[PDB]
Amino acid sequence: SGAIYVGNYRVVNRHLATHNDWANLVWEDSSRDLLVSSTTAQGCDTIARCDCQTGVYYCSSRRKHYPVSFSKPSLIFVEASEYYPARYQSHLMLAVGHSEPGDCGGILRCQHGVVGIVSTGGNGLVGFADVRDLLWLDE
Ligand SMILES: COc1cccc(SC(C)C)c1NC(=O)N1CCC[C@H](C(N)=O)C1
Ligand SMILES: [Zn+2]
């Protein structure tokens, strides 16, 4: 679990969005596994606007942060789950690092701010949904 709170927006994994997220929907994209809902309170986070390919992510299944080198946002095949059919997920960045089901939503940060959130994983891999191209989050 986990979310980004920036301005009057809450960014979550689309597959973990709540009834309240859908009732206050701003934007969603199943191909990216992202959903953004509106909030009444001002957020605590800021978003990176950069091309960093290294950073640090929070891994809830270890209660720890780990450093990672990750690929540029791209279209990657993701196997069927209870949440989605087999498909290509876009704007996804892969890295070597621990992740399990439950780790989705953990934040990836570089020196410039929030880069994205955990969205997929596998046998020693962790994948992140990028948010750096969503310029409207800042206004
Ligand atoms: C952090 O997520 C994981 C980590 C290790 C393993 C796993 S599936 C295990 C059966 C190999 C997963 N789960 C996932 O990759 N997803 C299930 C939830 C939806 C995700 C999506 N964006 O489509 C895909
Ligand atoms: Zn950066």
UniProtKB/Swiss-Prot annotation:
Give the positions the UniProt entry annotates as the active site: H15 (for protease 2a activity), D33 (for protease 2a activity), C104 (for protease 2a activity)
Superkingdom in the source lineage: Viruses
The protein's name? Protease 2A
Give binding positions for Zn(2+) 1. C50, C52, C110, H112
Native organism is Coxsackievirus A16 (strain G-10)
| Catalysed transformations (reactions) | Selective cleavage of Tyr-|-Gly bond in the picornavirus polyprotein
Quote the range of the complete protein represented.
Answer: 869 to 1007 of 2193
Question: What is this protein for, i.e. what is its function?
Answer: Cysteine protease that cleaves viral polyprotein and specific host proteins. It is responsible for the autocatalytic cleavage between the P1 and P2 regions, which is the first cleavage occurring in the polyprotein. Also cleaves the host translation initiation factor EIF4G1, in order to shut down the capped cellular mRNA translation. Inhibits the host nucleus-cytoplasm protein and RNA trafficking by cleaving host members of the nuclear pores. Counteracts stress granule formation probably by antagonizing its assembly or promoting its dissassembly.
Q: How does it assemble?
A: Homodimer.
